[PDB]
Point group: D2
Amino acid sequence: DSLAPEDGSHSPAAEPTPPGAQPTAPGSLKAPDTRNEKLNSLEDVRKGSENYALTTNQGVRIADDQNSLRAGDRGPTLLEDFILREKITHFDHERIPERIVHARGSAAHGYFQPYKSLSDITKADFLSDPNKITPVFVRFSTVQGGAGSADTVRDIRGFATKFYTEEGIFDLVGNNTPIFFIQDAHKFPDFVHAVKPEPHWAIPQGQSAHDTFWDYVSLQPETLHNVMWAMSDRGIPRSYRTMEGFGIHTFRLINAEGKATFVRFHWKPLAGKASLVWDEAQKLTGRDPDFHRRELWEAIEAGDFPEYE
Amino acid sequence: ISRLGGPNFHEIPINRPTCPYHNFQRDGMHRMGIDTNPANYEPNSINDNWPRETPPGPKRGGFESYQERVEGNKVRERSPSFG
Amino acid sequence: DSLAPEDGSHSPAAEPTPPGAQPTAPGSLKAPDTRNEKLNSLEDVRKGSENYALTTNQGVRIADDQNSLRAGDRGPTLLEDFILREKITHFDHERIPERIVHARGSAAHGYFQPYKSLSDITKADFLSDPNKITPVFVRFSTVQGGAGSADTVRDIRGFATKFYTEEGIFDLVGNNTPIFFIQDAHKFPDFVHAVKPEPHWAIPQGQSAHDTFWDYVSLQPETLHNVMWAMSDRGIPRSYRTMEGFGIHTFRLINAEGKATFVRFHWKPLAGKASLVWDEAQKLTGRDPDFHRRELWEAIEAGDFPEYELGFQLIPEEDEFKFDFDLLDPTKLIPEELVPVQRVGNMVLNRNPDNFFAENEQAAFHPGHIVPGLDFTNDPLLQGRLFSYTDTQISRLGGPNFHEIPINRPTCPYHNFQRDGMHRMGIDTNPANYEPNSINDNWPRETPPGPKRGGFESYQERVEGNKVRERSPSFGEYYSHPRLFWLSQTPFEQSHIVDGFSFELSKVVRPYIRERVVDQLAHIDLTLAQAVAKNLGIELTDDQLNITPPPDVNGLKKDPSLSLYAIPDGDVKGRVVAILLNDEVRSADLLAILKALKAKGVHAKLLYSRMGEVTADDGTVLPIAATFAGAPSLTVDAVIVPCGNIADIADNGDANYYLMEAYKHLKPIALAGDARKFKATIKIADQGEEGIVEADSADGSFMDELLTLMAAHRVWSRIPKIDKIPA
Amino acid sequence: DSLAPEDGSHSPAAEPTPPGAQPTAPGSLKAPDTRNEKLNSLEDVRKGSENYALTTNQGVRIADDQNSLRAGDRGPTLLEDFILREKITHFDHERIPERIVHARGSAAHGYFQPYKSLSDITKADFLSDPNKITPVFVRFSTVQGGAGSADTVRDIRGFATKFYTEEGIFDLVGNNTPIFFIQDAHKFPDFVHAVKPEPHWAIPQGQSAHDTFWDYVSLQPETLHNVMWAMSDRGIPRSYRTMEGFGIHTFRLINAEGKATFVRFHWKPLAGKASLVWDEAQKLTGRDPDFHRRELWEAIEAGDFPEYELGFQLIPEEDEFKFDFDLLDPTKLIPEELVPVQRVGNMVLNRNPDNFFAENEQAAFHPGHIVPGLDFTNDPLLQGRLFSYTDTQISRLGGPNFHEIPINRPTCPYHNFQRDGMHRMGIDTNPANYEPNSINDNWPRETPPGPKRGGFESYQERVEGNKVRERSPSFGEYYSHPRLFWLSQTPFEQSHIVDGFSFELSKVVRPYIRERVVDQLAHIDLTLAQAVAKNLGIELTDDQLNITPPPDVNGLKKDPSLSLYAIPDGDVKGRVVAILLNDEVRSADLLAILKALKAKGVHAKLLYSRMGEVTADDGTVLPIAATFAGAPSLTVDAVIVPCGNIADIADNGDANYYLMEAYKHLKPIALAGDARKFKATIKIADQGEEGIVEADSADGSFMDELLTLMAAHRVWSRIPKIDKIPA
Ligand code: HDD
Ligand code: HDD
Ligand code: HDD
């Protein structure tokens, strides 16, 4: 009953390997020895597969997963085939709405550690002890395109970090430029509608290069600063590893004595800052629309972990 | 699908089997189970075809319908015996 | 308060205009006088905008749509700002789930009209009289990629038509190849999961070129027939206008006397069959991921309406078992040499939607939506489809009232005892919500079946057998149809199939999967298998070289109707030519070029190294449509270079590459006067070659030769020359 | 194929008819001539039924709606039965989430008209012209129970009015008491969770009589004021027609000069104030859980329209701080003795919906739906309400397009740049979906504020303070308003409050909670506290007996407007009388009875020991409406027994109990001729007593005396006599 090759060449080595040397794999199979508190806490919902019987969602073993139940082997399919209907029902409802913005994104697990206690300026527990390790989950993204759009478009990039701290989840939801296009949230649907595919025909995907975007820009000069960044090579990063991150807004740090300090957040890439050039980026959306997602996944599989200060 | 919000209603705790369940179904709203199978289809070679079908048998076998004989034309008709 | 330009140049003309001549627009503003019964019935939900106040959804006029309400102009935003919250709430919930498959699609309104009454073979009302005009809504699609994926991927294409008939909605939900990959609907999630992005990392988008797809194929030889089609140039159509459509399954036509005839449905494109080549298609997903969506919309705005002839392959009930294959097997085609396609009517797509989301995204097609005069068969793929297309709408469209979404509404009457459900629009006045009832005199009432305006009754097919989960043995043949397809292609089409398999298998990381697929190809044709094997560094064994080929299909050595190009059918109307300008164009050349193109309905785009204008030798001001890089040769069907100051562009890398890319992609190229110096960049000798038009000046003969080349689509004889071209 | 009776008795007459005379029907079939702008605007979604074929939702006629498609008439059902699957799918998804609170409610259409222009104090367009008619849709409700819970529970009632104005929808979302239980919206889930069924076992339905509610009350004295109202007979109204309505919060009116006036909204019932008594209300939840829904629908079918006068309490901005309590505290009422209610206009409810689910269940009211001329205040309960009523519709009504559900649609224009979302009905043609735009000349456009037809601008209230989660100290007083309410009630109303607390606390299992509530009552009034304590077997301590009462409210020791009954306001129109028949009724009695009731708009129910008919002494055939047990005295306002063959019913247990129950519940009873023998059943002396009408015959003053009793609602003087009745 074995369909795997006898030489075992179907299974990727569970050790760091360079891009293309092995098939890519789920993280807990590729790197079983990598752990953190969050990864450990997900074990209760991880599901295996090897050596298990194929079942319905109700736990009933399936004998023939190749055929519908019919009245004769050339007959009509019967309504009483609950195995078919459960399998097709689940398939029929697989999709959930994509994010309104930043629908295209690539994510990884990791950890954060502060260099020293910041208790003089903030009572935040995750910043209180250099030995305190906080698990993170990070998602990098474009802004305009759908979940099935291309990576190397000209766009702003999102850089969202979920810190699983001992005193609650802290999400630092930033972008790869230090400002945004607009001043007041009331205008967000206007700006986003202008940059998104135009409503009559739903064109263009992953591009601000169309009338409605530049119409809005020309009528809203507050947008010009972030437009400058988007039109620069900042808009076409070489990799999620080679871009900066910013929280954009001024927030506050609050210490134990009640003192507030204004703060803006920054991520500094250990790999440095690097971008493509336009002709390359555009052609690459055709040759490999998954280039950034792939590069992130493969760097981690190689042990070449993305790092950000 | 409407009452419980989608196709993962078997993951709501009261509905969960206490016996094993494994298959190639994926995703859907409020998906709890995180599948590690490299494959989400069968037949597959990349996971040596697991999880695997099980032939019917006296115990722990796969489900097979009783091979009742069906004979008749396709009709929307009540059986006279019900009348 | 007016932000529009004083000259009115913001507003597109409400008249047919060629691609790029005007901004595109909602269909009811571009073509307000194009009407049909369905389009007219949508007027109750169309919303205008001009001269109206900006309001909340509750009708309250907004005074300041630029600012949130705050405590001081530098203060915190207040929870009482209901205008902000309503606007952001609506934004926050704009997205609905995309279709599980065929998420990427482009749609248009049109109409269908039969050529004659089909009453002798079907009682379907929409086919009963050549005077019956039926509105349609058609959505073309890819299969694998998301709604935001690219158009010109290698994939099967969907071709779904909603017929708004006087006796109900009929949805013909087909594809652009005559078979499907699998035999039984129970396997659909397996096949789709295998072709879709792999579940760990969600790669690759819009591509079958990955391990899991070819793993499934190698283990399920039933897939090989449709795989052959996908690896051919059928997988990369030039336009939705230049592909065929097929219902795939055998259905039944039922006439008034109750006689059943088996039928397979066909759409024949008036524009002919035409496809890209792989390198062009792949690069075009980067240069313009919206290319097919754009070309469909712009053809309709130009008056180049997509047209498709509906055809039926008809097989009497008594002939069910007269072929080498099972009629109910959706992995088998019916060769036109054995059963001709009888043309029965024509469909014209003549208006774009107003709002993509409301009309395209929310449209629900389902092959179970049939009408009296049609019926199903036991095809086990069709049988399971019947369950899926109603089920899936409960999440995708939010509940069981999806038929009340305007695009989905029948134009004929509908009345029943169904009630409630999320977003219920219809307010029922019937005292009864059940039947039988006396309190409403049993209305609405059942209708017996009959020749016209009768109730639906299934054809009383005899069913005999035991309840089994079992594939019919008649379905267990996998190689003869792939071989018939292979043998029916031209030599260059065969080369492109080889290159398709070779490219895709090269992207499979696990080598044994490649080897298993090559072994399957050896069961189809050894020339195909050896050619793919050579490109993969695989050597066939002596055992593989001795595999007996499968038998012919009912005596057929080939069927040229399976080739895109063996029988010429192309027409140039609606195609487009790039014209590469210089700063002092020979106006006489351009006059003759544009006159000849206009006479044939071929569009032109004037390209230069910058935007703005250039002035011809006689003072004619020429407006520039795009730069060489902004509208690459990928987006056109041919390239013409008129004479003038050729020195202006002779050393321009983009201009030289424009011709090299077009040359590599087998497109016609025409060079007038000093533009013939560009022959050096494409390595064409002074004596010239077939496929490169050249003359001292552009003229009638010059343009006749180019338009003849365009009618043949591509210059296949150039293929031996392109491998040395660095492009 | 017609199942209706040949005599047409299945169809109710489309004319006003009294309760029970005809089957009830959808409003547009019962009263097609009753129209308003909103009702007319719904015609595009109303669906008929008569003379139409039964179809699928796709418009396909159904031939056999009695059977599934099967392989043989005794065979398995086939998956290809799309008619079955569509019908069952729709059934399977009929239900939507019920409202979090106020899930049980009953609704009607109507209209509002102001008495005079209020332009001096508000620019609200619907209040600008006495000739301007504003359509309304009103939903009355309970609070705690589910959509399937009973009407006549002890609870607060909701009173929600949707005004379809020319300048937007205004929703006045009020209750039947002038205060709420809590001060800050942050506590709303705590309070509601405490009153709702307890989470382990989901008991009790429709009742605050359980530990968690009284636990919360005992720990949150701010609740005591509205608790007092709920424990009074206010908690058990006779009908939605006989209760007051209140907006509770202080809002603002804004005039064209920008001047703000504080306002509290009031509804005054034309039918007067009237409530049940507890034993009656509780038993009625069993005998007819739909009593209030039924009475509302049947009053409208009878042409006896519920009417309510809108009134305003108006407080100038400079008087904000001149009261002992904070105007922004929703646990405090504004006594009418301090600020009179000024009459504003009248609302008439004159047509029932067609489909309860489509119009009632799907209606969305929200107090943030205001119009120019109105504004909010910093009331911290109102402030949080503004968030909830938009948010909750995303799940309840399936997404952000809930304003497109027909009942919710404005009748005035609504245009904006919002797009998409689930169930999107409107098809936007605007080239732009953003502003500012030039491509549509910036339409739809913002509108500056102005005297009429202007944009919404918030009143520029001064805000000064630090960001704090802190209750205003001015809110920290909890007992003076409960005491004012207590002191304003009649002695019998006070007894009913004592009995309400006593009964509810008896259902609290943990005795310490009862003791803690009694301690709170001792801070309100020691007479109340002692009487409740006595009924609970609790002895007040000396310390409790020495608690100083809270101060008067701005010098008031009572305000009679807080009593249901202190100032008579009852009108008998729309009430109902049970008439207990015998097998040979004295027809002269019955003629005098029925005609006197009819002249005052009082309905009658002819009751007997069986259904069918009886014949009077003169041969008149009398149709029986219900049996004694089938329409118990709980469902009527008074009981009349005419003379005749009294021996027929004298020993009937149900007939005797009918009188005992009505007697216990303080209802007027009238006995003519030999019917006076029933005085022995209710233990009434030969000389008679006030509240029992008796005479030799029903002529003379008999009916006037009974109608006078009915105008006073109940016979409160009878209370000492019922306290030992075995009934
Ligand atoms: C008021 C609306 C609004 C405004 C003004 C912004 N966003 Fe946002 N953003 C959203 C509304 C939103 C959202 C609709 O809530 C999203 C989409 C789906 C989601 O979960 O959140 C989102 C997603 C989203 C993501 C993706 C998170 C993920 O990976 O899942 C990022 C990185 C940002 N945003 C970052 C920003 C930045 C840097 C902004 C400017 C400083 C910004 N957003 C303004
Ligand atoms: C049992 C499952 C199943 C099977 C075996 C098939 N499909 Fe399908 N198809 C669906 C389940 C489905 C679906 C999940 O129900 C979709 C996705 C969203 C939808 O509305 O229907 C769909 C969408 C869909 C569309 C897009 C319609 C649109 O534009 O909205 C087309 C053209 C087809 N299919 C065509 C086919 C063809 C030609 C098939 C083989 C003969 C086929 N499908 C087999
Ligand atoms: C912050 C939460 C919150 C608070 C403090 C209140 N409510 Fe509320 N109310 C809701 C949250 C809510 C809600 C959850 O949003 C409901 C349930 C379903 C709905 O549409 O709105 C609702 C329904 C609802 C209804 C039923 C409307 C209908 O018939 O559909 C009425 C009459 C009221 N409420 C009245 C009030 C009054 C008079 C309050 C105190 C002055 C009050 N509510 C406080």
